[PDB]
Amino acid sequence: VFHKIRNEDLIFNESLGQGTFTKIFKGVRREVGDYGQLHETEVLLKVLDKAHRNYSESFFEAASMMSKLSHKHLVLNYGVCFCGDENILVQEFVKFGSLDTYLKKNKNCINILWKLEVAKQLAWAMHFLEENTLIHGNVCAKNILLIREEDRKTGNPPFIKLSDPGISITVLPKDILQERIPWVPPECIENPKNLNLATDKWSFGTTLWEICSGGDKPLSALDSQRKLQFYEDRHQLPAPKAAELANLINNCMDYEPDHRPSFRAIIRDLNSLF
Ligand SMILES: c1nc2c(NC3CCCCC3)nc(Nc3ccc(N4CCOCC4)cc3)nc2[nH]1
């Protein structure tokens, strides 16, 4: 499925931290491009240990399945290196990084119309996935990548992409799912087999809360035990600072999975906010 990239064409330059059972690097890929031109392309490299075989199989099946659905708001995966003791996803490098970090670094000096445009773009990406009956399963602001900043002179909005799904919550340890409250929905805390398209509607609500809160993490003051009580008592998140999206957040974060609205309906709701 994935184009094989040879270790000899990959240069690792900078460590960018960790994901869930991944190590992330900035690097360069040497390749033959359009018209035969030789390029040194900036890439994002995600390294999984082959020994974690269940995790690696989950991670790469998810990246493969989404890359079969080419879309302007979905990250470009170039290929994989079965680099011996490690399996490496080679991805496009996105200039401005993850959205939660971007919002923090700009001190939430971001107007509501910018947030609405990013929300709409994410909703259109999710509508495409819903129409394709593909579950992402880890929608969050860390997995929103900022390709382009707003340009006030041209009127161009920011432009985002949704990153790869990562290891499925159906195979992750339960302690990890609990830490991931309130992105993982209540039905998946009850049973990870309840993963469904409805899951992404809940997580989309949590992601909107992140966007409206300038990149704060909801329930960050709560440990895992208190995160369970949060769901037990069936609380909702507080209205974010930018409260314009509070109703849509609450409508998406519906404890009844079957009541969560379609992404088509979400897009219409976003459009109605003037
Ligand atoms: C697919 N996935 C990607 C990224 N994911 C992030 C990698 C770092 C940890 C959070 C997720 N970053 C990407 N690029 C970055 C660009 C600038 C970055 N810096 C912004 C300014 O502040 C320091 C980090 C970080 C990552 N590209 C990418 N393609």
From Swiss-Prot:
Residues carrying Phosphotyrosine: Y35
Tissue specificity field: Ubiquitously expressed throughout most tissues.
The record's account of how the chain is modified after translation: Autophosphorylated, leading to regulate its activity. Also phosphorylated by TEC. Phosphorylated on tyrosine residues in response to interferon gamma signaling. Phosphorylated on tyrosine residues in response to a signaling cascade that is activated by increased cellular retinol.
Transmembrane segments: none
Superkingdom, taxonomy of origin: Eukaryota
Site (Breakpoint for translocation to form PCM1-JAK2 fusion protein): D175, I176
Residues covered by the Protein kinase domain: 10-274
Localization of this protein: Endomembrane system; Cytoplasm; Nucleus
Pathological association: Chromosomal aberrations involving JAK2 are found in both chronic and acute forms of eosinophilic, lymphoblastic and myeloid leukemia. Translocation t(8;9)(p22;p24) with PCM1 links the protein kinase domain of JAK2 to the major portion of PCM1. Translocation t(9;12)(p24;p13) with ETV6. Budd-Chiari syndrome: A syndrome caused by obstruction of hepatic venous outflow involving either the hepatic veins or the terminal segment of the inferior vena cava. Obstructions are generally caused by thrombosis and lead to hepatic congestion and ischemic necrosis. Clinical manifestations observed in the majority of patients include hepatomegaly, right upper quadrant pain and abdominal ascites.
Role of this protein: Non-receptor tyrosine kinase involved in various processes such as cell growth, development, differentiation or histone modifications. Mediates essential signaling events in both innate and adaptive immunity. In the cytoplasm, plays a pivotal role in signal transduction via its association with type I receptors such as growth hormone (GHR), prolactin (PRLR), leptin (LEPR), erythropoietin (EPOR), thrombopoietin receptor (MPL/TPOR); or type II receptors including IFN-alpha, IFN-beta, IFN-gamma and multiple interleukins.
Free-text domain note: Possesses 2 protein kinase domains. The second one probably contains the catalytic domain, while the presence of slight differences suggest a different role for protein kinase 1.
Family listed: Belongs to the protein kinase superfamily. Tyr protein kinase family. JAK subfamily.
Assembly and oligomerization: Interacts with EPOR, LYN, SIRPA, SH2B1 and TEC. Interacts with IL23R. Interacts with SKB1. Interacts with STAM2. Interacts with IFNGR2 (via intracellular domain). Interacts with LEPR (Isoform B). Interacts with HSP90AB1; promotes functional activation in a heat shock-dependent manner. Interacts with STRA6. Interacts with RHEX; this interaction occurs in a erythropoietin (EPO)-dependent manner. Interacts with ASB2; the interaction targets JAK2 for Notch-induced proteasomal degradation. Interacts with MPL/TPOR.
Protein name, per record: Tyrosine-protein kinase JAK2
Organism: Homo sapiens
Residues of the full protein shown: 536 to 809 of 1132
